[PDB]
Amino acid sequence: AVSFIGSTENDVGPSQGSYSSTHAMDNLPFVYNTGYNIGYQNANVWRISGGFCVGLDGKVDLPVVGSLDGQSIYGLTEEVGLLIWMGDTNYSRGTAMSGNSWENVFSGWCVGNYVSTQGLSVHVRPVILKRNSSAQYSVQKTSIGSIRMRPYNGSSAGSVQTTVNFSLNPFTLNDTVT
Ligand SMILES: CC(=O)N[C@@H]1[C@@H](O)[C@H](O)[C@@H](CO)O[C@H]1O
Ligand SMILES: CC(=O)N[C@@H]1[C@@H](O)[C@H](O)[C@@H](CO)O[C@H]1O
């Protein structure tokens, strides 16, 4: 069996956080080293039991404005982009996102004759896109995409909520250019 125990709408990163970085103007696109700080994580989004098998698919709705090392650079503003990862609970298990389609972000696992849970995580990193002198960039609260649980091996979601959404909290980038 499966049931939904998380939240439908989830914020990514601290609200109106400020991030500073320094980069050479010739080093673009530039990814801010924010670690897993601009993210969301919850080990308990679905409760599963009795042989239920489940994985996760992720979808980013932001426009693809570029590509970096095999993953999409999603657009926020003309000057700021975003790299995105979605996956199982541990941030380290995040899957690099590309495109705007539902992608497998967690191969899945099957619970046995007991009850457990299925979680998820999302983290992103800001990207400076255009050459410019030192400047401050502001990013508005913006919807990013979603993550859906995906039953397999004959398991079924039935009427259970399968999808949750993620909204990027506003932030400011204090960009120093050398
Ligand atoms: C409470 C807890 O840790 N539950 C985790 C869940 O978050 C994760 O999605 C799943 C698959 O790795 O393993 C469970 O044990
Ligand atoms: C278009 C679409 O829904 N893509 C799904 C993908 O999410 C899923 O991970 C994969 C196998 O699990 O099967 C594809 O059909």
Residue spans per domain, the chain: 1-178
**Nearest in space to 147 (alpha carbons), one of 105, 117, 107, 84:** 105
Superfamily classification of domain 1-178: Bacterial adhesins - F17c-type (2.60.40.1410)
Cα-to-centroid distance, 61 and ligand 1 (Å): 26
Question: How was this one solved?
Answer: X-ray
- Quick one: DSSP state of residue 91? G
Residue 172 is encoded by which pair of tokens?
Answer: 């400011």
* CA dihedral of residues 37, 119, 149, 62 (deg, nearest 10): -10
Cα-to-centroid distance, 81 and ligand 2 (Å): 26
Q: Is the CB of 104 inside a 6 Å radius of any atom of ligand 2?
A: yes
Q: How far apart are CA 129 and CA 159, in angstroms?
A: 42
Enumerate the β-bridge partners of residue 8.
none
Nearest-CA residue for ligand 1 atom 3 is: 43
Enumerate the β-bridge partners of residue 121.
41, 87
CA 155 → CA 51, 55, 72, 101, distances in Å? 8, 11, 32, 23
Ligand nearest to the CA of 41: 1
Q: Which of 4, 86, 88 to mutate to test the pocket of ligand 1 (most atoms within 8 A of CB)?
A: 88
Question: What resolution (Å)?
Answer: 1.7
Handedness of CA 66, 38, 163, 53 (dihedral sign): positive
DSSP 128-162: E-S--SSEEEEE--EEEEEEEEEE-TT---TTS--
